């Protein structure tokens with residue numbers, strides 16, 4: 001019932017600013033402190049500050065004074081954070097979270113990923129992973145999609161628009177020479193493939209791309 | 221600021237066993253210590269607040285203890301669903317501070333990988349690139365070694381290795397090793413082999429193909 005819905009991923013150049021949102025529902029927005037938390041890989045969790053939307057009172061961890069700015073708009077039931085003078089150290093997942101009453105951070109947003117870089121957005125290239133011509137058969141088969149050369153994060157992969165979730169294995173992205181790659185594999189019954197359409201759906205929010213790759217037997 | 225230190229950054233334990241995750245404060249924080257669990261999708265959940273009080277839908281297996289400077293979250297009998305990263309949090313007053321987290325893995329019965337090898341697709345080849353993928357499926361423990369041989373010779377350059385998160389249901393891992401070459405490099409050789417070395421066997425699991433398709 002209580003929900004905190006944060007805005008989508010952002011790519012930003014060094015020295016610029018970003019403003020992210022946290023829309024609250026299922027409670028009286030103006031009667032609870034909204035806090036912001038920074039998660040940078042290898043830096044645990046860091047408290048930035050909080051705001052009480054009822055009277056606009058704010059507090060900050062000293063280092064974020066003049067760096068992050070917290071606002072709230074009552075009519076929109078939405079809390080905002082604006083972070084200026086962006087550096088690579090500002091690349092992180094940022095969470096909004098509600099405090100109280102007589103409990104601490106009981107409700108969390110899903111997090112907003114910020115990537116600070118001078119590199120422009122690059123959509124992934126997608127290639128099928130298909131068993132070789134001279135491969136040993138069997139009741140099951142493993143198929144996949146190679147997702148290559150994208151920037152920034154993230155990429156999500158689904159199979160058959162989400163209908164195929166069992167036997168799915170998607171490895172973590174790896175960063176190499178400025179670009180990301182990952183791979184997703186699925187093991188399905190030998191009577192489902194090549195009998196049915198097996199598609200991997202590759203989404204890259206930053207480029208607003210929604211790609212499909214049909215997995216088809218090799219050319220005889 | 222109050223420095224929050226967690227006992228260890230990673231922990232591995234068997235199902236049914238008692239698990240303790242520790243946290244220490246640089247000053248006395250009384251009972252103002254909270255525990256959060258983060259899942260691999262980044263979702264954060266409050267489990268324990270005010271040192272020892274359980275929160276919403278938190279199983280009775282969880283308990284909390286504290287002296288004011290030293291704290292721990294205890295799971296009485298580890299369950300499959302307990303996988304994740306656990307963070308402590310002091311909220312005595314601003315500025316709030318957090319522990320750096322303890323990643324909890326399930327210790328599982330040893331499982332050998334199932335290995336698959338994937339030649340480059342015609343689609344990639346026609347565009348000038350060639351990736352060869354070795355996929356190692358559903359193994360435990362996580363530690364695993366992949367060796368590439370091209371025409372019998374070891375290659376280490378242009379290889380990218382990556383793992384899945386531990387399987388939320390059966391606690392296994394999977395991983396892929398991707399060998400990147402140009403089409404011209406790829407067409408200059410015939411045999412493509414990956415050898416998977418895992419503690420489950422002293423002999424490597426070997427998968428190969430010949431570019432000649434024979």
Ligand SMILES: CO[C@H]1O[C@H](CO[C@H]2O[C@H](CO[C@H]3O[C@H](CO)[C@@H](O)[C@@H]3O[C@@H]3O[C@H](CO)[C@@H](O)[C@@H]3O)[C@@H](O[C@H]3O[C@H](CO)[C@@H](O)[C@@H]3O[C@@H]3O[C@H](CO)[C@@H](O)[C@@H]3O)[C@@H]2O)[C@@H](O)[C@@H]1O
Pocket residue numbers: 033050059099100101102103104252254269270311314
């Ligand atoms: C059991 O331990 C757990 O509870 C602790 C949290 O408990 C507090 O939650 C309620 C709200 O607390 C916030 O609001 C207060 C006033 O603004 C702030 O003290 C507190 O904000 C936090 O402190 C920083 C500002 O100093 C902010 O950054 C941070 O968010 C407190 O309860 C009071 O609020 C509710 C509703 O308003 C009232 O019921 C209660 O107030 C009391 O009742 C009278 C008015 O109704 C008033 O006279 C009394 O104050 C509660 O203390 C959590 O840390 C532990 O895990």
